[PDB]
Amino acid sequence: MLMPRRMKYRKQQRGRLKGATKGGDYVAFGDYGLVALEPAWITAQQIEAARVAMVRHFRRGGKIFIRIFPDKPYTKKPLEVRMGKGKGNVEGYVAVVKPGRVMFEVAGVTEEQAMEALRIAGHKLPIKTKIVRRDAYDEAQ
Amino acid sequence: RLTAYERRKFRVRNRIKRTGRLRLSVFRSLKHIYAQIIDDEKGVTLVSASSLALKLKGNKTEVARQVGRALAEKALALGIKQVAFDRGPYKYHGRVKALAEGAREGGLEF
Amino acid sequence: MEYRLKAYYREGEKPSALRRAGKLPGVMYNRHLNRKVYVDLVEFDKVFRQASIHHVIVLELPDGQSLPTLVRQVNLDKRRRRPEHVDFFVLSDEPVEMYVPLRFVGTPAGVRAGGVLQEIHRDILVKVSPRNIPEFIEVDVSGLEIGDSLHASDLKLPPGVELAVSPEETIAAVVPPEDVEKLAEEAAAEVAEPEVIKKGKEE
Amino acid sequence: GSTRNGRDSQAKRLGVKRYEGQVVRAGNILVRQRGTRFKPGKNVGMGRDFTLFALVDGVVEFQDRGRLGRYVHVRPL
RNA sequence: UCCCCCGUGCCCAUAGCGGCGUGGAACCACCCGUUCCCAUUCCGAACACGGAAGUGAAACGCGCCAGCGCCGAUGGUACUGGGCGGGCGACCGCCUGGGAGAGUAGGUCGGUGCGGGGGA
RNA sequence: CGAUCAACGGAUAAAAGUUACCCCGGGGAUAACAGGCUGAUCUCCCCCGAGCGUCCACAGCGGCGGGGAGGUUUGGCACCUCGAUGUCGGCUCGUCGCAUCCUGGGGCUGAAGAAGGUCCCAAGGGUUGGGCUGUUCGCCCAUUAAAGCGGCACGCGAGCUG
RNA sequence: CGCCUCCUAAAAGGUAACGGAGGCGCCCAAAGGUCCCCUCAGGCGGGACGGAAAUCCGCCGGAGAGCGCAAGGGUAGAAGG
RNA sequence: CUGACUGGGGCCUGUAGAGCACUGAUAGGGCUAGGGGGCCCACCAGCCUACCAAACCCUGUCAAACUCCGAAGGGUCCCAGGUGGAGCCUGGGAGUGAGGGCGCGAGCGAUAACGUCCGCGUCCGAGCGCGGGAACAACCGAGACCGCCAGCUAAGGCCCCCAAGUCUGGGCUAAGUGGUAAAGGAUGUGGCGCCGCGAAGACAGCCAGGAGGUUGGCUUAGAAGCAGCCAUCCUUUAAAGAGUGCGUAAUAGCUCACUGGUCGAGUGGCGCCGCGCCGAAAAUGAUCGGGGCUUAAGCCCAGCGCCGAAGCUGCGGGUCUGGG
Numbered sequence A: 001m002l003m004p005r006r007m008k009y010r011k012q013q014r015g016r017l018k019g020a021t022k023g024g025d026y027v028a029f030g031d032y033g034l035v036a037l038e039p040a041w042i043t044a045q046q047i048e049a050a051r052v053a054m055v056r057h058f059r060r061g062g063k064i065f066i067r068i069f070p071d072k073p074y075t076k077k078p079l080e081v082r083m084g085k086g087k088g089n090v091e092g093y094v095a096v097v098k099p100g101r102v103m104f105e106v107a108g109v110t111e112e113q114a115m116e117a118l119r120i121a122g123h124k125l126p127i128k129t130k131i132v133r134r135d136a137y138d139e140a141q
Numbered sequence B: 001r002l003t004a005y006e007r008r009k010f011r012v013r014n015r016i017k018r019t020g021r022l023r024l025s026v027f028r029s030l031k032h033i034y035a036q037i038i039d040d041e042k043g044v045t046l047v048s049a050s051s052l053a054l055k056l057k058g059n060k061t062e063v064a065r066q067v068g069r070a071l072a073e074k075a076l077a078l079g080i081k082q083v084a085f086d087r088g089p090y091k092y093h094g095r096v097k098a099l100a101e102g103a104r105e106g107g108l109e110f
Numbered sequence C: 001m002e003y004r005l006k007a008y009y010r011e012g013e014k015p016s017a018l019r020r021a022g023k024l025p026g027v028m029y030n031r032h033l034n035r036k037v038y039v040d041l042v043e044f045d046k047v048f049r050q051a052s053i054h055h056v057i058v059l060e061l062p063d064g065q066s067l068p069t070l071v072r073q074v075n076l077d078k079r080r081r082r083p084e085h086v087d088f089f090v091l092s093d094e095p096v097e098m099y100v101p102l103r104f105v106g107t108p109a110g111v112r113a114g115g116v117l118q119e120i121h122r123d124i125l126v127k128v129s130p131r132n133i134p135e136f137i138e139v140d141v142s143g144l145e146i147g148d149s150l151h152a153s154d155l156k157l158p159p160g161v162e163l164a165v166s167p168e169e170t171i172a173a174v175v176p177p178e179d180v181e182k183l184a185e186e187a188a189a190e191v192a193e194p195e196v197i198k199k200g201k202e203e
Numbered sequence D: 001g002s003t004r005n006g007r008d009s010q011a012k013r014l015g016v017k018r019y020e021g022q023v024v025r026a027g028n029i030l031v032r033q034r035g036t037r038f039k040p041g042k043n044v045g046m047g048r049d050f051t052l053f054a055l056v057d058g059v060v061e062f063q064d065r066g067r068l069g070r071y072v073h074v075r076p077l
Numbered sequence E: 001u002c003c004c005c006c007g008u009g010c011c012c013a014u015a016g017c018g019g020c021g022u023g024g025a026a027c028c029a030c031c032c033g034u035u036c037c038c039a040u041u042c043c044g045a046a047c048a049c050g051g052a053a054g055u056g057a058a059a060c061g062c063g064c065c066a067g068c069g070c071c072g073a074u075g076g077u078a079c080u081g082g083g084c085g086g087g088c089g090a091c092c093g094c095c096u097g098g099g100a101g102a103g104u105a106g107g108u109c110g111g112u113g114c115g116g117g118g119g120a
Numbered sequence F: 001c002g003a004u005c006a007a008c009g010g011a012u013a014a015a016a017g018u019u020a021c022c023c024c025g026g027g028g029a030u031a032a033c034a035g036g037c038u039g040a041u042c043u044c045c046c047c048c049g050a051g052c053g054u055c056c057a058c059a060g061c062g063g064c065g066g067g068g069a070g071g072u073u074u075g076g077c078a079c080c081u082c083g084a085u086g087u088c089g090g091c092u093c094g095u096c097g098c099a100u101c102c103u104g105g106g107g108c109u110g111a112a113g114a115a116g117g118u119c120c121c122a123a124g125g126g127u128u129g130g131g132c133u134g135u136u137c138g139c140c141c142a143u144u145a146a147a148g149c150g151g152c153a154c155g156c157g158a159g160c161u162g
Numbered sequence G: 001c002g003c004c005u006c007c008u009a010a011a012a013g014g015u016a017a018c019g020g021a022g023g024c025g026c027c028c029a030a031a032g033g034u035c036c037c038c039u040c041a042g043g044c045g046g047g048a049c050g051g052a053a054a055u056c057c058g059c060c061g062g063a064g065a066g067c068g069c070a071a072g073g074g075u076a077g078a079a080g081g
Numbered sequence H: 001c002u003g004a005c006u007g008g009g010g011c012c013u014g015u016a017g018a019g020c021a022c023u024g025a026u027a028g029g030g031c032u033a034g035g036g037g038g039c040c041c042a043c044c045a046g047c048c049u050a051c052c053a054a055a056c057c058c059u060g061u062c063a064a065a066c067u068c069c070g071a072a073g074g075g076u077c078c079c080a081g082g083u084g085g086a087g088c089c090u091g092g093g094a095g096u097g098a099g100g101g102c103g104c105g106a107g108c109g110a111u112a113a114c115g116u117c118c119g120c121g122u123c124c125g126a127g128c129g130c131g132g133g134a135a136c137a138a139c140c141g142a143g144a145c146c147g148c149c150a151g152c153u154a155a156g157g158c159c160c161c162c163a164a165g166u167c168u169g170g171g172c173u174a175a176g177u178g179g180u181a182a183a184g185g186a187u188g189u190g191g192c193g194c195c196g197c198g199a200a201g202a203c204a205g206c207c208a209g210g211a212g213g214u215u216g217g218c219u220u221a222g223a224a225g226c227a228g229c230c231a232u233c234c235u236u237u238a239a240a241g242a243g244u245g246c247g248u249a250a251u252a253g254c255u256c257a258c259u260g261g262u263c264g265a266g267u268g269g270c271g272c273c274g275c276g277c278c279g280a281a282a283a284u285g286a287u288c289g290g291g292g293c294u295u296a297a298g299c300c301c302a303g304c305g306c307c308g309a310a311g312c313u314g315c316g317g318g319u320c321u322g323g324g
C-alpha cells in the first residue's frame, strides 16, 4: 500500500495542522469528490480502506482517483520504553490533510453509485467529509 | 556563451581596474590601432590617439609606436602621468607592445 | 446562448462587508479599462453555472453601459468551497484566447467492452473572434478501445477558431475499469521497505 | 536504544558586521562570510577567508549589481 | 546639437533564444601571405607579424516578428506586528496597521554615458 | 621537539574490583509501594457493512478501516510522602459499583414444545464443600438456581497470621 | 565526551534534549607564489578494433561538471584545466 | 542627555505563506528506451499487448535538513522626541548559578502527561497582600506608606444565600439542555434557500388495472421480473421496468414504478443556518457553590441604570527625594 519508494530522510518532524488546504481544493479528474472537513494525518491503511470499499461497491466498473499520498513517515517508540534514547522507529506513513482537500474522485459511474461509494469511503476515514460534484467553479480553476 | 576572446578581455581588465589607475585601452584592428585613456570612476575618456585619426602611414608596428608617442604628448598636456596599460584581448607583443613603448617615450608613467 | 448579469461599481467598501451583504466582489479589465465591481452572489451563481468561462456574460453597469465579458478567473475560498472574487474580462473586436467546451459524441467501443471514458479535457484553449464563439466542439470517441486516446490534433475545428495548445496535448482516454477481481492480488502484494538515499562517504 | 547523532559544531557568528551608512575606520570588518556572497568594492579588501574589510576611513555603501553580484563599498569622508 | 560606424562604460534578460531581412564608401571582419617578431602538448585554427586582390558567405552591427524565454499589474486571498474573543482539544474567528506567492490583464526582439572616425 | 593528557580547559610521574557483615552525612533534588496526572497498552461499548449464515448484510455473526468510555493491567511521568505512607497471599469483618453469575420483568430468534442463543430493564437478596500449589489466578473432584467481575492505599498487619 | 557541516533555530547574532543526518584526528614540494594561455557536465549525429562509457569530428548546451575528502556557502568575468 | 520606548531614513535577513525552477517524493494520462508475456521464427528478422516501466511532457500534489519566490516583523546605524530609582565610567559589598505555571513558536512524546527540552513574553517565585473566578502560587482585575461609619470605578456581578435590575426591547430552547465528551444516528424545533409534481387535477386514503413474446436468454442441479452474469428487446395498451420489495426448492401468489375513477389544495425530495435529542457504565451521599429558576434566574442580539478592590478621587498625617 502507498508509501514513498525512496526518500532523502528517514524521519520527519511533526509539524502543524493549521489553515485551509494548500491546493487540491477543486475537482480535477472525475465527476464527484470526497472533501476533507477537518485536518488529520490520514494513514496509508485508511486510504487503502477507503479505496477498497469503493472498488468493492463498484464490483466491476468506474475509476477511482486517489489525490492524497502518504509521504510523511509516522514514528513510535517501542512499547514500555522510557523517554529519551533517540527518536522512535518508523511504523507507517500518513498524508497530511487539511479542510477543503479533495482526497478522492470517482468517474465512469452513475450518480447513485458515486454518492454511495463515496459515503462508505468516508466512514473509513478519521475525519468528517463532504461529497461534491464537479462544478463550473472546478472547471474554471 | 562567451568566447575565449571575451573571457580574456574581461580577465585582464578586471585586474587592471581593481588598481584604480586611469587605464590606457588599446584596440587593434586588422588595419589600425587606437588608444584612449579612460576614467572608470566617471566612465569618461580623457584623451585619444588613433592611427585613423592621425592618418598614419605604413608599417603597422612603427605606426603603433607613433600613436603611442602621440597619445603621450596629448596626455602630459592635460596633466596625466600615471596610467595602467590595458592590453585587453591582446598579448603584450608586437603592435600593442610598440604602442606601449611609444607612450612610455612620451613620459606616460607605467 | 448569451447571458446577462447586473453589476455595480465599488470603491472603498471592504470586501468582507460586501460578502456579508450577499454581494460578490469582482474586478473588470482589459487593455483599456480597469474597474472594481461587485455582483449579487445569488444572481451571479445562477449565470455562472450556466455560462462558465465558455459563454459570454454581458454586464449591465449602472451607468447604462453594457459590456460583453468572459469570466477570466474565479477565486475560491479553499475552506468553504465558495467563490470569493471574479475577474470579468471585457471583450473587444480583436481575437481572444479562451476555453471552448468539448462535446464527446459517441459511445467508445472500450466503454462497451467495460472501460471508462476519462475526459481529460472538458474544454480546449483556442484563439477565436468574440463574434465567432462556437457553443462547443464535437469529438467522435466511438472508435476508442481500452486503452486508446485522442489529442487536440484530432480536433476538427469550426471556422475561425485555432488551437492555442500543443496538438500533442491529450484530450480523452479510455482506461480499464476498477475490478474487485484485482483486490486479492493487491492485498497479498509485497512492497519492500523504502530506501533512504545514501549520504556521506556512502553514495 | 542509543543515538548515532548528537553532534553539531559551534556556531560561527557569520553575517554583515557594518550596514550601509555606518562610519567605519580602515581595517574594520564589514562582512563575515563563506565564499563571495558579497564582493569587495571600492576601498574594500578581502582576506583569505572571504572576510570583507574597509581599506579607508569612511562610510559603508551596499550595491546590488544583479548578475555581477552584491558589493560593499566604503565612501571616504 | 541628428544619422551610421568603431572603441569603452553604466542599468543588469523589457537587454535572451529563434525566424526573417539588411549593411562594405567608411569602419569592422573574414580575407591575402607565413619572410620577419611571436606561436601550435599536432595544426598560422588560435596567438602573432607583413599585407590589401576579393567577400559581406561566416562573424559583428542594424531592423522586423511575441513560438520560447524574460518582465508583469489592478483586484482578491494566504500570512502577519499590535489589540481581542472562541474551542476539551486538533484548531477557529473579530479589530487595527502591514500584505504576499500563484494566476489574470498586459509589457518586451533593449535603454543610456563618454571618446573617436564618417555623414548632413 | 616529546600529548588517542580522545573523560579532548588536560586532578598524580604512577591505580582495578567487591560488600547480603556493612557504616555516616544527605535527598522525596531521585528509583522500588500506594496515590496523582496521563491512558500508549488493558477492559468494555459503539460507527461503517465487505462477507458468512442453503436462500437472507444485521437470528447469530462483522473483512479493511473509523469513534469512544472506564481507570481494575503493564507502563509513561516523578507531583505529596526517604527526621519511614509496612508489601504478596490467607483469615476476620464488611461495604460499594454494575459492564448481571443466579433469582424477577422483557423484545428479537434460524423461538413447535422443553432447552438454548442475543439484546434490554433490574444491585433486593443470594453467589457451596473439597484435591494441588505460599500463591492471587488457574486446573481438577463432587455438587449447585448460580458457583459473577471489579472498587474501597492491588480495602482491612496500632485486627490476627507470616 | 574535543573539532567540522546541515537542520531543528521562531528571515540579525545566539539558542536545548540520550532530537534528525553526516564528517575530522589528514593531506599537497605542488595540490604553494606569479605570469600567460584554456573552459565544463550532458544530449544528438558522425567514426577501424571500440562496448552505456576509452580517443576523434560537428551541432546544441550558464553551469546541472570541476574545485583531494563530510556538508554547506562560494565559484567559469574562476576558486576549474 | 548619552537611556528604555518612540518618529523618519538607509542597509542586513530567508521564517509565515506560497511555489516546483534546483534536490528528492508523487497519482493518473500521454509519449516512449528496456524488460515480461503472446503470434511467428533460428535463416535474423517481424508483428501483437487491458504487463512492469526509464527519460520526456501534460494534469494534480508533497518536503526541518528543497527554493524561481517571499512577507508581517526583527536587527543595526544616522537625525529627532524622550530628565528616567534613565544611561555611561571607576571602585566597595553581594546574593543567584534546583525554578515554576500560563500564552505563542518549535523539537522530543502518542497532533499523551500537573511530561520533557529550547525560543519570545508574562506572572508567581519575592505580591500565599487586595477584588473576581464556590473554594485554589502564577486565569481575569489590580502594583497594599498610615488613618476615615466619604465619593468613582475595574474584572465580575445585580431572584434569595449575597452588595446592586425579579431592568427594557427583539429572537431562540422545553432538553433542567443550560449545569463537561466523539464518530455516527433521528419526521425534535425554528429560520432559509432549491427542485420538482399539481386544479392540462397532484400527494394520502380508498378503487380497479399492472398485461402476449417469457417455465426467456450465461444455463445446469431448480434459476420462471425479484440466487450471479457479457442483455433489455418487443407485443397488445388507458398503462406497464423482461421488474422495486416480500414469497417459492422450484412455481404461483402479494405488491411497487405504473394508468384509469374518487374526492378538492397543496404534496414529495434536496441543501444550508440557529437551538435542542440519542450515542453517555465505576465504585462512601448527593448537588449547577446551594436554594431554586422555564415569554428564566437558560442561550443569542441591542440598551439604560446600579453594585463592586487596599485601583482612582476627597480630607488629614508620616518619611525620603527634588524644587522653592
Ligand SMILES: CC(=O)[C@H]1O[C@@H](OC2=CCC(/C=C(\C)C(=O)N[C@@H]3[C@H](O)[C@@H](O)[C@H]4OCO[C@H]4[C@@H]3O)=CC2=O)[C@@H](O)[C@@H]1O
Pocket: F032, F033, F084, F085, F086, F087, F088
Ligand atoms: C516498607 C518500608 O519500610 C518503607 O518503604 C515504603 O513502603 C513500601 C516500600 C516498598 C514496597 C514494595 C516493594 C519494594 C516491592 O518490590 N514490591 C513488589 C510488589 O509491588 C508488591 O506488591 C509485592 O508483590 C510480591 O512481592 C512484592 C513485590 O516485591 C512496599 C511498601 O509499602 C515506605 O512507605 C515504608 O515506610
Ligand SMILES: NC(=[NH2+])NCCC[C@H](N)C(=O)O
Pocket: E080, E081
Ligand atoms: N492582524 C494580525 N496579525 N492577525 C493575525 C491573525 C492570527 C489569528 N489567529 C487569526 O486567525 O485571526
Ligand SMILES: [Mg+2]
Pocket: A013, A014, A015, H107
Ligand atoms: Mg514535535
Ligand SMILES: [Mg+2]
Pocket: A041, A043
Ligand atoms: Mg495517526
Ligand SMILES: [Mg+2]
Pocket: A074, A075, A076
Ligand atoms: Mg509519531
Ligand SMILES: [Mg+2]
Pocket: A080, A081, A082
Ligand atoms: Mg520501562
Ligand SMILES: [Mg+2]
Pocket: A083, A084, A085, A086, A087, A088, H108
Ligand atoms: Mg527521544
Ligand SMILES: [Mg+2]
Pocket: A075, A076, A077, A087, A088, A089
Ligand atoms: Mg517517536
Ligand SMILES: [Mg+2]
Pocket: A043, A074, A091, A092, A093
Ligand atoms: Mg501507522
Ligand SMILES: [Mg+2]
Pocket: A021, A022, A023, A096, A097, A098, A099, A101
Ligand atoms: Mg491537504
Ligand SMILES: [Mg+2]
Pocket: A122, A123, A124, A125, A126, A127, A128, A129
Ligand atoms: Mg468519518
Ligand SMILES: [Mg+2]
Pocket: A141
Ligand atoms: Mg493551479
Ligand SMILES: [Mg+2]
Pocket: C045
Ligand atoms: Mg451558492
Ligand SMILES: [Mg+2]
Pocket: D002, D003, D004, D005
Ligand atoms: Mg552511538
Ligand SMILES: [Mg+2]
Pocket: D005, D006, D007, D008, G019
Ligand atoms: Mg543531534
Ligand SMILES: [Mg+2]
Pocket: D006, D007, D008
Ligand atoms: Mg561532539
